[PDB]
Amino acid sequence: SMAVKSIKVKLRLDDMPEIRAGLWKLHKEVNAGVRYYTEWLSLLRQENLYRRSPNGDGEQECDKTAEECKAELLERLRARQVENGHRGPAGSDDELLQLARQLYELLVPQAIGAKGDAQQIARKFLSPLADKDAVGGLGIAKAGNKPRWVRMREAGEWEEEKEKAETRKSADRTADVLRALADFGLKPLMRVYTDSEMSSVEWKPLRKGQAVRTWDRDMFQQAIERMMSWESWNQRVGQEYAKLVEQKNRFEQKNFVGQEHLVHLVNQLQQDMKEASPGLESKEQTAHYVTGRALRGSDKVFEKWGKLAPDAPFDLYDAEIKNVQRRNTRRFGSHDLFAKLAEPEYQALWREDASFLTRYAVYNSILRKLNHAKMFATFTLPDATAHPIWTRFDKLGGNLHQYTFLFNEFGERRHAIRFHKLLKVENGVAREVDDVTVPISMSEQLDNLLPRDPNEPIALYFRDYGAEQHFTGEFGGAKIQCRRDQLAHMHRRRRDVYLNVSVRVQSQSEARGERRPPYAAVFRLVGDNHRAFVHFDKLSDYLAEHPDDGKLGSEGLLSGLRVMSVALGLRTSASISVFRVARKDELKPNSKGRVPFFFPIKGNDNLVAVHERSQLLKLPGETESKDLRAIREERQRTLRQLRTQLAYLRLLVRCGSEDVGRRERSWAKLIEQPVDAANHMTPDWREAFENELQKLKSLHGICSDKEWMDAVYESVRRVWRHMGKQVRDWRKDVRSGERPKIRGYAKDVVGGNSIEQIEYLERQYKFLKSWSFFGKVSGQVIRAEKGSRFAITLREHIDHAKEDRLKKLADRIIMEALGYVYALDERGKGKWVAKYPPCQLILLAELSEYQFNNDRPPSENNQLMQWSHRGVFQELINQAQVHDLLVGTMYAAFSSRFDARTGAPGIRCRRVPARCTQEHNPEPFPWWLNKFVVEHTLDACPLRADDLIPTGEGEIFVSPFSAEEGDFHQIHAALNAAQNLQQRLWSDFDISQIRLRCDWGEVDGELVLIPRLTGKRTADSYSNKVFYTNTGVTYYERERGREKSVVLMRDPSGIINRGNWTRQKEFWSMVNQRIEGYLVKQIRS
RNA sequence: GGUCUAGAGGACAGAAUUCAACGGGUGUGCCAAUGGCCACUUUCCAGGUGGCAAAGCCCGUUGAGCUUCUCGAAGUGGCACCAGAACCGGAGGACAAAGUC
DNA sequence: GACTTTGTCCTCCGGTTCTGGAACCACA
DNA sequence: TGTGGTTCTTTTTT
């Protein structure tokens, strides 16, 4: 309910090693304490425990079975009765096992599916289960916090709340489980860890009537927490495994009931390629099964196959596959699958049902995910070094061992932390101490914390560049952490120790005693994706209650109503456009009296959404210039050289194969062509590679196999030893190299926080992995070992690079929504200034369904992981909680393919750079300009500067503006998608207004398209309607309500096909003809 | 100024363009930002493992030298930061064979 | 550079379920 | 504002 933030602080422990060894001893103690109580809970659970399987990661093994638990649990229970000196009844083995099971389901209610408070369960049971003289859990104790109804009865009156105490105390088996534990001699069930033989720490002597320390209560709660979440996963894994078995069986008899003979044929196919595969021997059950990845683009190949003869030769079937792949190499599947599907014995899989193979691929994916799906969540005990938990410290006033944050205890910015209880180690003995003050290393992050109240040293202020007034906050719990790498080590050194302090920060809305900000009642955020919906009823009165008064920054959140839409991307990290709700009684702007761009708002006819500003929120490094383009090519020069050199080394290794017909085919590829017509290799290594080739040419055929193969391997060593020194010097210049480094703030940097610079790092890791695992023997597989790490320092930099990009992206989006802009003065050299009124809502694109999938090509999944938009979406919700900013998503289908201003569909285009048209020193054409010149054969046509090139993926969106041939409307593709989200907000957009899915059928005697009713909006408009045709392309609605489905598209601007309902294929070709068809013809003249 | 609207910090093309003394400090990182030497990893490369060492790093002041202003002054650092444990998934990466633009 | 099938290792992105208290009364 | 036991709770990207 309140924004929590963690500021990790480092302890200066150089001058006091006895406390450093005490903090490390305390860490092993708490980890041992939690492990003791968690192990106890596992025995009370008396069910199977599963661990990670060694000798092969994937499946899981049974670490401890149920009988192993009950036997070990009874061994503890019987021994405890002896220790307690029980003279009464000892109870049957079945009685004790059931009693222990009853207690476990009270300790971890999630075992049976209930909810549980880890705080209160640990407080309620630790003493009654380990204190010899405990009276808690029963109804005897008079102490404790007063019930709800007592607080009501004294002030705030009661009747129903006193009832709820009894009727809940009725269903509380705690009192009886405790008395049953008492009658069996198990009154102390477990031991107090600090007061047992397990800890060698000389703890402070126990007070009278004390048996549990604050350290034990910390250990017990953290044992309940991990045991709760794990049980919640045991239930979740078993549930999701059950729905998988139901999915497998609900599918066979719901998709291909009458298509049983095709199922037997694809099974023959999947074992056909299984035997005839030259790859490694299969081991998986679903090996060589038909997957959706292998069928990528099968729709294009099948339609082109239907126009053929079943007895026709292969080459006309195969060359029709090559044409589909050439259309886009990225979105194509397996050539061998389509090659075997063209064989006449297998043609029935795609001839009868052209959608059966994709249907059966889904069945195979359910098969594979079921063979790997786990049935139980693995169980791992905490460990001081392997799976560490951290010693918590309550804030000042808390119930655990507390701490104070001492502002400026030793200097201007020299802060300190006083642990009221701690451990100290002097000459090997651990001793509990009181009131240890520990200074903190300098942290510029701590400069955002100011003390608020001297009498309450928990209070603080919180600074922020996007808040004119500082927030009020409180210190919270803290935890003592060490690094993970300094953890598995021991050595004999005096290991950095950190305190992770939790800071609770109160937002300006929360400071006014309001559950939600006043503008939250205007925007309905639904679901985990925060799908935004506008309450059009209420915004007519909100503007009356919250008029725009010009207050900037965080001070203007309660005045006006503004929404900022954000279009995330790779080239530009974010593209924004701000709109303002205002009456249509407006005027002309300050620049040159141009009627401002606005959108109509549904419901209110007096109010519109006026566009305020649009901006490209480029993170540093996402710019481009002549010198920047040169440096980025030079920074990867020697890398791209070594990458192509290694590729030819492998071609040389294959020549030493033991397979005649492999080395011969490999030796052919080496001598048939010149070595490096593209000049991608280095000069000297290529001269060495040419010396070896001409040496083997004077031996090929002349010599014998075991004498030619011996020379090929010896030649590999020289070239490998040679290129080895090259890789050595390249890395030397990478780490120690002296490259120019920016000082101060500066725009137009080489990499910065861009995707390219992270991939520049990723490219180095990918090559080094390919260089170390390079094999000198042809045919051998070289993988990493079962516990190895590779390029540890480089990998951590790559992750830190993405982590820094992610946080700076979210802050940039947030600082812009609030109306702050980082501007330069050169007398101040950069400072955040409030320039605009803030936006109350950040509208993103609904991209939760844009996930990594095996159906997507690996290059597309890779970009999705470099992008990681869902990570950006979660970091936005994190940083926005303090500023009272709402973040929501908008349905984003076709957001980049339709005009935001006009509504007409369009195509993403690029413009020809002037580097390729200048007569003085022109630069070569890029990849996209080549693919376009080739498709339409424009080799002899002179391109001009800023010529539009329709590529389907550029940064310039182009749409037909009217029926005039050549009349276009051009705008930034990202900003066009951002404004499209805004247009869809104020109009309550639904996809049924532009696209519809239908199926054929009879209604009034004729064949018509019956639209699929998806969502209440589609049912509200098209349930009672149906679509007819006279030509099969353009459909018209009626009023009465093949085998594949038909998707109809619609131009809301009426420019393309008069805005009638058009079949999807021909619709986008009309879009293509009116844009691409025009641009090609004007170029040809 | 050319191209394109959203008329904005507008967007595409274009043209244009740092030592050492002393003192203090080194939370997590990034910005061209991936530390150095030795030894081992059988071999020389990569990668890993260990050891060693001095610092390398900012900040402040004082000098120099650079690089722009006016008829000597200024400028030689900026940025972001909500975490913890366990778990279940999703997918990349590398190697070998084979087949493909 | 882009694409597929076979296995096996290191890594990364996404999401889940717990969490990072509050307060009363006898103490001696 | 002590502690320690106790109760507190119902398509999109490029």
Short mmCIF file of N, CA, C and O in Angstrom, two decimals, chain A residues 809-861:
data_model
loop_
_atom_site.label_atom_id
_atom_site.label_comp_id
_atom_site.label_asym_id
_atom_site.label_seq_id
_atom_site.Cartn_x
_atom_site.Cartn_y
_atom_site.Cartn_z
N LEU A 809 15.79 3.97 -18.58
CA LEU A 809 14.63 4.07 -19.46
C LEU A 809 13.39 4.45 -18.67
O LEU A 809 12.68 5.41 -19.02
N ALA A 810 13.10 3.72 -17.60
CA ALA A 810 11.90 3.97 -16.82
C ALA A 810 11.91 5.37 -16.21
O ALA A 810 10.89 6.06 -16.21
N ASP A 811 13.06 5.79 -15.69
CA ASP A 811 13.15 7.13 -15.10
C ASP A 811 12.96 8.21 -16.16
O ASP A 811 12.29 9.22 -15.90
N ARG A 812 13.53 8.01 -17.35
CA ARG A 812 13.33 8.96 -18.43
C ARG A 812 11.86 9.08 -18.80
O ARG A 812 11.34 10.18 -19.00
N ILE A 813 11.16 7.94 -18.89
CA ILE A 813 9.73 7.97 -19.19
C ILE A 813 8.97 8.65 -18.05
O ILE A 813 8.00 9.37 -18.29
N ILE A 814 9.42 8.44 -16.82
CA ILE A 814 8.71 9.01 -15.67
C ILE A 814 9.02 10.49 -15.51
O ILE A 814 8.12 11.29 -15.24
N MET A 815 10.29 10.88 -15.66
CA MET A 815 10.63 12.29 -15.56
C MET A 815 9.94 13.11 -16.65
O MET A 815 9.68 14.30 -16.46
N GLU A 816 9.63 12.48 -17.78
CA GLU A 816 8.95 13.18 -18.86
C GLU A 816 7.45 13.28 -18.61
O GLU A 816 6.84 14.31 -18.91
N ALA A 817 6.85 12.23 -18.04
CA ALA A 817 5.43 12.29 -17.72
C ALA A 817 5.14 13.36 -16.68
O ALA A 817 4.13 14.07 -16.76
N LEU A 818 6.02 13.49 -15.68
CA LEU A 818 5.85 14.50 -14.65
C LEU A 818 6.12 15.91 -15.14
O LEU A 818 5.80 16.87 -14.43
N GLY A 819 6.69 16.06 -16.33
CA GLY A 819 6.95 17.37 -16.89
C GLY A 819 8.34 17.92 -16.64
O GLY A 819 8.53 19.14 -16.76
N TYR A 820 9.31 17.08 -16.31
CA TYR A 820 10.68 17.51 -16.06
C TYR A 820 11.55 17.18 -17.26
O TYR A 820 11.39 16.13 -17.89
N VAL A 821 12.47 18.09 -17.58
CA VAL A 821 13.38 17.93 -18.71
C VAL A 821 14.79 18.27 -18.24
O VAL A 821 15.02 19.34 -17.65
N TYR A 822 15.73 17.37 -18.49
CA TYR A 822 17.14 17.61 -18.19
C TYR A 822 17.71 18.54 -19.27
O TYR A 822 17.85 18.14 -20.42
N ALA A 823 18.02 19.77 -18.88
CA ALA A 823 18.49 20.79 -19.82
C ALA A 823 19.87 21.28 -19.41
O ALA A 823 20.24 21.23 -18.24
N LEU A 824 20.61 21.78 -20.39
CA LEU A 824 21.98 22.23 -20.19
C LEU A 824 22.03 23.75 -20.08
O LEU A 824 21.23 24.47 -20.69
N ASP A 825 22.99 24.23 -19.30
CA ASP A 825 23.18 25.66 -19.09
C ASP A 825 24.62 26.05 -19.38
O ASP A 825 24.90 27.19 -19.78
N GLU A 826 25.54 25.11 -19.15
CA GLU A 826 26.99 25.30 -19.26
C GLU A 826 27.50 26.30 -18.23
O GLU A 826 28.72 26.43 -18.03
N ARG A 827 26.59 27.02 -17.57
CA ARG A 827 26.89 27.66 -16.30
C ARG A 827 26.51 26.78 -15.12
O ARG A 827 27.05 26.96 -14.02
N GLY A 828 25.61 25.82 -15.34
CA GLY A 828 25.26 24.81 -14.36
C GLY A 828 25.52 23.41 -14.90
O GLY A 828 25.74 22.47 -14.13
N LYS A 829 25.49 23.28 -16.23
CA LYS A 829 25.85 22.04 -16.94
C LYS A 829 24.94 20.88 -16.52
O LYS A 829 25.37 19.90 -15.91
N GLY A 830 23.67 21.03 -16.87
CA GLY A 830 22.71 19.96 -16.67
C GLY A 830 21.98 20.01 -15.35
O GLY A 830 22.59 19.98 -14.28
N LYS A 831 20.65 20.08 -15.41
CA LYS A 831 19.82 20.15 -14.22
C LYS A 831 18.38 19.83 -14.61
O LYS A 831 17.92 20.22 -15.68
N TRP A 832 17.69 19.10 -13.73
CA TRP A 832 16.28 18.82 -13.95
C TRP A 832 15.44 20.06 -13.66
O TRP A 832 15.57 20.68 -12.61
N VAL A 833 14.57 20.42 -14.61
CA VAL A 833 13.69 21.57 -14.48
C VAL A 833 12.27 21.14 -14.83
O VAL A 833 12.06 20.37 -15.77
N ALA A 834 11.30 21.65 -14.07
CA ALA A 834 9.89 21.42 -14.37
C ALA A 834 9.47 22.36 -15.49
O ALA A 834 9.37 23.58 -15.29
N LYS A 835 9.22 21.81 -16.68
CA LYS A 835 8.87 22.60 -17.85
C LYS A 835 7.42 22.46 -18.28
O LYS A 835 6.88 23.38 -18.89
N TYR A 836 6.78 21.34 -17.98
CA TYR A 836 5.43 21.06 -18.45
C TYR A 836 4.55 20.66 -17.28
O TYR A 836 5.03 20.19 -16.25
N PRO A 837 3.24 20.84 -17.41
CA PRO A 837 2.32 20.22 -16.47
C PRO A 837 2.43 18.71 -16.55
O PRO A 837 2.73 18.15 -17.62
N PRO A 838 2.23 18.01 -15.44
CA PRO A 838 2.43 16.56 -15.44
C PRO A 838 1.27 15.82 -16.08
O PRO A 838 0.15 16.33 -16.22
N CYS A 839 1.55 14.58 -16.46
CA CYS A 839 0.54 13.66 -16.96
C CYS A 839 0.14 12.71 -15.84
O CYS A 839 1.00 12.12 -15.18
N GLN A 840 -1.17 12.55 -15.64
CA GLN A 840 -1.65 11.66 -14.59
C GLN A 840 -1.62 10.20 -14.99
O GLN A 840 -1.70 9.33 -14.11
N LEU A 841 -1.51 9.90 -16.28
CA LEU A 841 -1.55 8.52 -16.75
C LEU A 841 -0.47 8.31 -17.81
O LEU A 841 -0.32 9.12 -18.72
N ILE A 842 0.28 7.21 -17.67
CA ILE A 842 1.22 6.76 -18.68
C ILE A 842 0.58 5.58 -19.40
O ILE A 842 0.31 4.54 -18.79
N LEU A 843 0.32 5.74 -20.69
CA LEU A 843 -0.35 4.72 -21.50
C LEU A 843 0.70 4.00 -22.34
O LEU A 843 1.30 4.59 -23.24
N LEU A 844 0.90 2.72 -22.05
CA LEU A 844 1.81 1.88 -22.82
C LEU A 844 1.01 1.03 -23.80
O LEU A 844 -0.22 1.08 -23.86
N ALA A 845 1.73 0.23 -24.59
CA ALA A 845 1.12 -0.73 -25.48
C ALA A 845 0.92 -2.05 -24.76
O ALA A 845 1.80 -2.52 -24.04
N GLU A 846 -0.26 -2.65 -24.94
CA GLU A 846 -0.55 -3.95 -24.35
C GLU A 846 0.23 -5.01 -25.12
O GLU A 846 -0.17 -5.44 -26.20
N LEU A 847 1.37 -5.42 -24.57
CA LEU A 847 2.28 -6.35 -25.23
C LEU A 847 2.57 -7.56 -24.35
O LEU A 847 3.64 -8.18 -24.46
N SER A 848 1.63 -7.92 -23.47
CA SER A 848 1.83 -9.09 -22.63
C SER A 848 1.86 -10.37 -23.45
O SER A 848 2.51 -11.34 -23.06
N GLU A 849 1.16 -10.38 -24.59
CA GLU A 849 1.13 -11.56 -25.45
C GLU A 849 2.30 -11.62 -26.42
O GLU A 849 2.43 -12.60 -27.15
N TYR A 850 3.16 -10.60 -26.44
CA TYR A 850 4.34 -10.58 -27.30
C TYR A 850 5.51 -11.18 -26.52
O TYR A 850 6.38 -10.48 -26.01
N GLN A 851 5.51 -12.51 -26.42
CA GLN A 851 6.48 -13.25 -25.63
C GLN A 851 7.41 -14.04 -26.53
O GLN A 851 7.19 -14.18 -27.74
N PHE A 852 8.47 -14.57 -25.92
CA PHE A 852 9.36 -15.47 -26.64
C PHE A 852 8.64 -16.78 -26.89
O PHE A 852 8.05 -17.37 -25.97
N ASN A 853 8.66 -17.24 -28.14
CA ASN A 853 7.97 -18.47 -28.49
C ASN A 853 8.81 -19.24 -29.49
O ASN A 853 9.54 -18.65 -30.29
N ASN A 854 8.71 -20.57 -29.43
CA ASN A 854 9.50 -21.40 -30.34
C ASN A 854 9.02 -21.25 -31.77
O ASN A 854 9.78 -21.48 -32.71
N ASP A 855 7.76 -20.86 -31.95
CA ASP A 855 7.25 -20.62 -33.30
C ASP A 855 7.94 -19.43 -33.95
O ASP A 855 8.05 -19.38 -35.18
N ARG A 856 8.42 -18.48 -33.14
CA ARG A 856 9.14 -17.34 -33.67
C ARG A 856 10.57 -17.74 -34.02
O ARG A 856 11.17 -18.59 -33.37
N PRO A 857 11.14 -17.14 -35.07
CA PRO A 857 12.52 -17.45 -35.42
C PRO A 857 13.46 -16.99 -34.33
O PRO A 857 13.16 -16.05 -33.58
N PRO A 858 14.62 -17.64 -34.20
CA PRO A 858 15.53 -17.30 -33.10
C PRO A 858 16.01 -15.86 -33.13
O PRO A 858 16.25 -15.27 -32.07
N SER A 859 16.15 -15.27 -34.32
CA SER A 859 16.56 -13.87 -34.39
C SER A 859 15.48 -12.95 -33.84
O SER A 859 15.80 -11.88 -33.31
N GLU A 860 14.21 -13.33 -33.97
CA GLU A 860 13.13 -12.52 -33.42
C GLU A 860 13.03 -12.69 -31.91
O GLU A 860 12.77 -11.72 -31.19
N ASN A 861 13.22 -13.92 -31.41
CA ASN A 861 13.24 -14.12 -29.97
C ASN A 861 14.42 -13.40 -29.33
O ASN A 861 14.30 -12.86 -28.23
#
